[PDB]
Amino acid sequence: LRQCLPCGPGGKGRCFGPSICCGDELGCFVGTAEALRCQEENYLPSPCQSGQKPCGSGGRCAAAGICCNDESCVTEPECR
Amino acid sequence: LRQCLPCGPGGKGRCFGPSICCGDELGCFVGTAEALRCQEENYLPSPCQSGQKPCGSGGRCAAAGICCNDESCVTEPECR
């Protein structure tokens, strides 16, 4: 599968959704200027590979201590 | 009730959780440096007033198109 789109400061983050941009050390940007690029995800039916640990309801440990699916993010200790 | 703590760039955002900082036009920062100040919320038992529309369950429209509670945020059109 294709890698998820790079986003945020220095492209250190990855798009987990159309409006979600996260990096392990950066945290998660939801609906901010940093996640603007991620809008392209809506035009790629191809699911992407982040390589992050699965979590919650079909989620992914998008960042340290944060579990996000394509539309939400929750603080999760298990993601540390 | 006390107003919620200010956070983010130019203090235009406010803390909805210990790790969540949002601004109507800025979007939401979950676990990012912008939300570091929000940790202080953990040492304030009393609830704060954000003056924002309710949403989901316990959630508040923290930003245009985003509903958040103390530990999570979700893209929500009802918040636009």
From Swiss-Prot, chains A, B:
It comes from the Eukaryota. Transmembrane segments: none annotated. Disulfide bonds join 4-48, 7-21, 15-38, 22-28, 55-67, 61-79, 68-73. This is Neurophysin 2. It comes from Bos taurus (Bovine). The lineage of its organism: Eukaryota, Metazoa, Chordata, Craniata, Vertebrata. The chain holds residues 38 to 117 of 166 of the full protein.
